[PDB]
Amino acid sequence: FRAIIESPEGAGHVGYQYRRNTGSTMRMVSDVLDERVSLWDFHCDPSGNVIQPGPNVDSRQYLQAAIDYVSSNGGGTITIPAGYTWYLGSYGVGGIAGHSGIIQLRSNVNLNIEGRIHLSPFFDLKPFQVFVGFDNGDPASSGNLENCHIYGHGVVDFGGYEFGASSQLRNGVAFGRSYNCSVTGITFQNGDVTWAITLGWNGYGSNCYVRKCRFINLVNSSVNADHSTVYVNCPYSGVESCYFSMSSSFARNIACSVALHQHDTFYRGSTVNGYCRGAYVVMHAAEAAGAGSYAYNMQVENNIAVIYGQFVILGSDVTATVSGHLNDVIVSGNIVSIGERAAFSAPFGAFIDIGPDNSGASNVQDIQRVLVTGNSFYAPANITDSAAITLRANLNGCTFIANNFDCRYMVYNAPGTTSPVVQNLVWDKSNVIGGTHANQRAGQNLFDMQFASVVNSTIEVQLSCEDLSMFSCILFPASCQLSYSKITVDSAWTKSMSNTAVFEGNQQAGANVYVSYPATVNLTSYNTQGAVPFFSTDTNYAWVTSAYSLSINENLDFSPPATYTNKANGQLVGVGYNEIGGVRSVSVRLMLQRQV
C-alpha cells in the first residue's frame, strides 16, 4: 500500500468526491488532476524526473511530446506555466522541417501561454518558424489545422537575433491550412522576422483571428528583406484590437502591420507606431487556389497609426492562368499620420496607394468599388512626398467621401513614370483639405493628374484656407485624356490664384466634360449708352456655357454684366449697363462654367 501510494499510480488510489456531496462521482485524485495538463507533465528525462527549464535546456521535444499526446485524446489545452522561461533550441522533424519549423501544432490542442518562450542562440542567423500547423513540407499536400487556439498573458521572444541572409524566412505562428484558429493576448517581441503570424495558406482556411496581441520590435537589421506582422491568407478572418510597434530605422522602410489577402477579412481597432505601412489589401492571382480569384469584403477600420510610407495599399495581379480582382473595400474611421521625417527619406507617404505589381506593372490591376470615408490623415509640412492617394497603377474605381486630408498632395502620380488608366475616381466635395502645407507648394499641383486617361471621374476641390504657393489646384497634362467627368474648383480662398484648374491639352472642351473654376478675364464694351454688350478680349472660351461675376464693380457710371455666355469665336459676351456712354475696359474675376 505504501509502495502503491508513493508510486506514480498513487494518486489513482486516493479517493475523492466533490465537496463531500453524496450525489457526486466517486473518483480518484489522479482523475481530477488528469482534467488539466501542463508542460511539466512532459518536461522530464527518460527516467521521468522533471527537468527545470532554462537557457541551457532545449524544451522543444517536451512541448512536442505534450502536443502529440493531447492530440491523441481528441484535444485539450496545454498550459505553459507562468514564472518560467522555456527555451527552444533545435528544429522540429518531419512535415514541419520544410518550413524551418520548431513546434508542430495539432488540431484541437490549444496552448495557454502564461510564461515566456524564448529562442536560444542555436537560431542566430538561421531561418525559423516557431509554431507550424502544416503537416507536410509541401503546403499543397498538407492536411488542415482545425480548432487551435494560442492565448494567455505570456510572451514569445525571438532572442534579438538578426537574419543571416535576406532570402531566409522567419515566422512566429504559421497556422497553415487553418480553420477556427486564433491567437489572443500574446506579446511577440525582440526579433528580426518576416512575419509574427500567418493565417491560412493561399485561400485555404477560415475563421482565423488575432486579437489583443502586442508586436514589439520585430525588425532590427539591414539584412531583413521585408516584413508584414500578420499575413491574412484565408477568408472570414482578421485582426482586431492589437498593438504594433517598431523602433528600428529599417522598419520605417520595410515593415507593414497587416496583409489582407482574401475575401471577407478585416483589420480593426488597432494601434501602429514605427512602421513603413499600415495594411496591404491585395488579391494575388498566385494565392487564389483556396477561396477564388476575388478579394472582396475587405475592411480597414477604426485604427490609429503613425507610419513612414503608405497606410493602405491596394492591388491585384495576374499569373499565366489566373487573374486577381479586388472590389468591395471599405477604409473608414482611421486616424493616420506620417511620422516626423525628412522629405523622400522613406517610401512615398500616402493614405491610399494604388500599387503596381511586384514586377512594377501598372496594367494588370482590377480594383474597384472601394469606399474611403471618415478618415483623418496628417503629414508634417516639410514632407513633400505625402498624398491622400498615390495613384500609380490602373484603377477601376475608388470613392472618397467625408475625409480630412492634411498633406502635400491630394491626388498624385509621378510624371514620366507609370501612366495609369483611371475610371470611377470619385472625390466628393465633403473631403476637407487641410492647410499644414500652405506656402510649401511652389511648382506643384494640389491634384496632379499624371495619368494616361481619366473617365467617369469626379474631382470636387474645396479649399479651407489660402495657399498661393501652389501652381494650380488641379492640372491635367496634355497626354491625359479626360472624358465623361466632373471637375470643379470652389472659389473660396482662390481669388488671388493665377491658375485654379489647368487643362494643358484643353480637355475641358470635351463634349461630356462638366467643369467649373475661377478665372480672370479682360473685357471691353461697346460705346452705347444704355444696355450694352461687353466682350472678352481673349478668344479661349469657346467651351464655356456660362460665367458669372466674382468681383465687385467699383464704378458708378456703368456696370459690367453679372453673367456671360460665349460666341463661336471663343469670346465671352454679356449685357451690362452704361448709365453714360463710353467704351469700357475692365478686368473681372469670373466663375467659368461648362455644362454645370
Added chain:
Amino acid sequence: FRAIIESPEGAGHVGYQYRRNTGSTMRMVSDVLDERVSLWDFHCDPSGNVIQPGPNVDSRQYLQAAIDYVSSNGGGTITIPAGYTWYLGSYGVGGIAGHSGIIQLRSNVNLNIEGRIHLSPFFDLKPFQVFVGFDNGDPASSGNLENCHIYGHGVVDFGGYEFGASSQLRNGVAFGRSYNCSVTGITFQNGDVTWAITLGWNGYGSNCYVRKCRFINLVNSSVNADHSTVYVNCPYSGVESCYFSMSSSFARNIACSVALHQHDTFYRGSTVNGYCRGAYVVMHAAEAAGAGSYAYNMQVENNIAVIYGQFVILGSDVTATVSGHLNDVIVSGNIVSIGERAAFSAPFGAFIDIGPDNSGASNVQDIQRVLVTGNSFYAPANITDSAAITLRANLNGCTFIANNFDCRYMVYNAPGTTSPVVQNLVWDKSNVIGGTHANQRAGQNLFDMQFASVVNSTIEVQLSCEDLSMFSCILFPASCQLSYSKITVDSAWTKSMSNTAVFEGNQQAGANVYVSYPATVNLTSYNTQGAVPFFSTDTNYAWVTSAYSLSINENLDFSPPATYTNKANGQLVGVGYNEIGGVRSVSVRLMLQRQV
C-alpha cells in the same frame, strides 16, 4: 487508514500546503480539488461510478445535477470537458418544460464549454430550447437569471434534425429575464432552429452580450417558418465580433442574423454570409413591458455582410393599449452586398427597409431620428429588386449622409401597394450613386417616390456616371403630395437625358418647394438689333424663379441670354444680344431653378 485513503474521503485526509510555504494554509488535497468542478463530478450512476458520455448516453440529468449543486453554493464555473462529446437525450422537467427546455440555467453558475454538446435523435422533428434561464412556464411569472456566462472553445451541435412542423420553436440559449449574462467563443452549428440565442424577455433584463461566437448552418428545411440567429430583447445588450453563415437555400429567404428590439442595443464588427437579412431594429408594442415603449440608442456598425434580402429593417407597431416608437438609430461603417442571385428570387434587396407590421399595416409606425452614414452597398447589375431604401411604411425621419450605394434604385416603393406618409427624409448630396446598374434602368426611376405624401424632405441627386436608360432621376406621381421640401438634380452626366426630375402633378410649383434640375427649352427672340429678349415657346415655367445656360452658343452674330426669369403666362424670358438683327430660334439646355 488504508480504508479511509481508498474511500471517497481519502483526499480529505492527505495534507497540503502550497509550495511548501510555511505561511500558507494547511489544507487537504480535497480542498484544492474542490476549487474546480466539472461534469465528471456528476456524470455517474447511482453507486457513484463514472459513466462515459456518448451517443447512447443521455447526459442531461448529470449536467442538471451539477448546475443545481453549484447553484446551492452561491455559484461557480462548471467545465464541460474537452475531448468528449456530451449528448442530450430527454427534456428537462419543471419550469423549463413550458419552453421545451433541456437544461435549466441558474444564477451565478457559468458553463465553460470546452467539449461538444450534441442533440440525440430523440429531438428529431421535435421543438427544443437547449439552455433555458426562465424558471417558470409562464415567462411573466418567471424569476430572473443573473450572472450566467457560457464560454469556451466548444461546440453546440443541433444534430442536423429538421423541424417537424412550422409552428414548433427551437433555440440554443434562452437566457430569460436575464441580467449580466453572456455567451463568448462558442460555435453553434448544424441545425434547423428558430434562434441560436435569445437575450432578455419583453424588455426585462440588462447587460447581456454575445461575443466571438460562430453560427454555422442553422436553417436546413422548408418546414422552418422563420429564423433570427440572435434576438436581443433586453436593453444595454448586444452582439459583437461574431461570425454568421448559412448554406441553405431556405436561409436566403427566411434567416436574419440579429434582432435589436430594446433600447441601448448594438450589433457590431460581425461578418454575415448566406442570410436573407442582416438586422431587425424594431419596437414591438407587444414587447414593451420591461423597458418601455421606445427603442432608442440603436447601433448597427462596422459589419460585413453578403445577404439576399434586406440589410437593416426598421419598424414599430402598436397593440390595443401600447404604441411602440423607434428613434435615435445609427447605421454606420457597414459594407454590404446582395449575393449573386436572379432578380426577384428572394425578398426585395435593400440596404434599409422601412417595413410594414406583421399584419401588413403601414400606418402604425413612429420611426424617426435615424442616421445612415459611411456605409457601402452593392448589388449585381441584374438584380432589379435592389434599393438603398425600400420605404414601404410611414416614416417620420431618416437621414442619409456620405454613403456609397451601387444598386438599381436609390429610393423605392412599389406602386399600387402601400402609400406611405413620409416626413424628414434627408438624402444629402454626399451620397455617391454607383454605376453598376447603368444601362439597366429602362422604364425605371432612380428615385421612385411612390408615396402618399412627402414633407420636410431633401433629395439631392448626384450622378457619377451616365445612365441614359433610366426614365428619370426622380419621379413623383400625381398622387404624391410634396411640400416644404428640397429636390435637386446636379447636371453632371445629365446633358443627354430627356427627363431629369418629373413631377406628374406639377408639385414643384408649391409655395415651399425648392427645386432645381436640367431641362431643354426652345426659345425665340424678337428681331431687334442689340440687346434683345428671348422667350420660351412653351408656357410651363410659371414656377421657375431663375434659369441659366448649360449649353454653348455656336453663333457669332448673336447670343441667347445667359440667365432667364419667368413671366406670368409661364414663359421664360431673358435678355441676349443680336450683333445683327433678326428673329432667332434656339434650343438650349438650361438649369431650371425654383427658390434656390
Added chain:
Amino acid sequence: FRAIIESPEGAGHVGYQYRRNTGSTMRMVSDVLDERVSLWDFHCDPSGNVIQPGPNVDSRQYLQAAIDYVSSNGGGTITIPAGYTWYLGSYGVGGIAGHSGIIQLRSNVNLNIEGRIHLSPFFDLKPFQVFVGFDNGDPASSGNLENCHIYGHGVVDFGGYEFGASSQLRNGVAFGRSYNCSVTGITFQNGDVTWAITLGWNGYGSNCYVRKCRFINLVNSSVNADHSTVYVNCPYSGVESCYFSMSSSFARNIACSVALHQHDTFYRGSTVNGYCRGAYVVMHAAEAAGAGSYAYNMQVENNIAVIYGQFVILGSDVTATVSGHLNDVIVSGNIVSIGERAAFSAPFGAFIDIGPDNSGASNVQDIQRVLVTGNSFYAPANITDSAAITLRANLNGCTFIANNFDCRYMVYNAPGTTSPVVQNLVWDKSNVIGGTHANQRAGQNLFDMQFASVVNSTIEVQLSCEDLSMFSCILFPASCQLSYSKITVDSAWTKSMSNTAVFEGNQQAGANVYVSYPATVNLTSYNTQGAVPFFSTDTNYAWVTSAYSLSINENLDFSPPATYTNKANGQLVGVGYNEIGGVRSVSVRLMLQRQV
C-alpha cells in the same frame, strides 16, 4: 508514513503521472496542486487553519500575503474564489500608505476575481484606493508596475459609503506607472468615488486597457467633488466595450465616463447612461512628464451615450515651464443624447465643448487637427442649453463633416463671457441640422458667433426644415473680426426668414470673405421700353459681387433682371425687360453672393 501523509507534506509523497502515460513526468500530487493558487492558500490564522471570509473578517492581510509570495516566484495568477464575499477592513502599509492604499499590486501577479470584494464600514467617510500599483508614497519615486491583469466575472463593491469630505480621493484600481496592465470583465458598483480605475501616472506607462467592465452607481452624494470613471494617463492605452451607469442626481452634474490624457489613446464601443460627461480629451501641461507635451492620436468612436452635460471636452493648458498641445483627434460613429431634463438644470449641453482651463482661462489652449464625423446628437426641444459645439476657449482647428445634429444651437458661445480666438473651424455642408427645436428659437441665432475673431473658417449652413422663430441662421457681433472665411446659407426653407446671415459690423465686406445668403431687396426701374435697368432702392450692397432671383415674376408686361451686379454707391443693378414702358417697382427675394 501515516504521519507524513496526514502532514502538510503529505501530497508531496503521493505519486502521479498524467493519464498513466509512461512518457510523462513522475510527479507528486503537491506539484500539480502547486500549478494553481488561490486566496484560500493564504487565508489562514497563525497556526495555518483556514479562516472563512465574511463581514467580520478583514481579508486584506491574506490577499497581500498571496500577492507578495507569487511575486517572489516570478508571477502567476491568484484566484479570488466564486461563491464568497471577501471583505477588506484596514489600510495597507508601506509605499501604498501615501495613496490611502488597501492592496498593493505587484508585477506579473494577476488577479482572477471570480467572487466578490467588498469594503467594510471601517472605510465609511474615509479616502481609499483599493488596489495600488505604486510602490512609493511619492509617485515620482515609484518603481513600475508591469504585466498585471485583473479579470473575471467577479465584483468590486465599494459598500455604498459616502465621502467624508470633498477633498478626499477614492479609487478602485490605480495601476501606477503601469506597463501592460489591464482590467477585463469586472463589475465595479455601489460607491461614492473619484475614479474606478486609473491607468498610468503623468505619462509614464504603456499598453494599459479596460475592456468589458461594468461601472454602476459610483457617485451617490453632494460631498463628492468630481468623478471620472476611468482616467487614462499613459499612452498606447484605452477603454473598449464597457458599460457605465449612474442613477444619482449628483452624477448628472459631476460625473464623466472617461478621461484621455496622453497620446495614442482611445475610447470605443461603450455605453453610457446617467453621466454629466462622456470623455475629456485633454493635454494637461502638469501631466507631461512621461510621454511629452502633446496629446495626439486621440480616438472616441462608436459609443452610445445618454448624458446631461457635454459629450467630448477638448482642452490643453500650460504651467510655468511646460505648454500642453492637443492635435490629431477623431470623434466618430457616436450616437449621443441629452437626457430628459429642464433647461439649465445641469452643465450646458454639448456634443463638443472647447473648455477653458481649470482657472477659467481661454487663452492658453493649442487645439487643432480635430475631425468630428459621422456622429448623431439629439437634445429634447425644451433644452435651451444644447449645442453641437460650445466653443468657449481659443481654438486652432476643428473639422465637422457628415454629422447629424439635432439641438438648439449649432455653434454657440455665451456673450459677454470668454472671447475666443477661432481659427480653422470647418463646418461642412454635409452636417445635417435637425428640426426638434424648430419654433423654440425666438431671439436666438442658430450659429451664434460670439468670438473675438474668426479666420480660416468655413460655415456652410443647410437647413432641413423651416424654423421661422430663430432671429438668424448665423450672426457675428461687431466685436468679432472675420477674415479669410467662407460663410454660406443655403436658401432651402429660408424664403420667409427676415434675417438669414447677420454681420453686425458689416464684416462680410472684407477682402477675403466669401459669402452668400438670401435677402429681400426692393428695386425700381427706369421707364424705358425694352431692355431696362432695375436698381435697388437701398445702398448697402457695395460688397455684393453678384445676386440672382429667388422669386417668381407675377407680371406679363415686364420682367426684373434674373441677375444683378453692384455699383460704387452700394446699389444693385441688373438689366430686365419692359415689354411696355413704365417705371417698375418690385420686391424680390435674391441670393446675395460675394466672391462665390
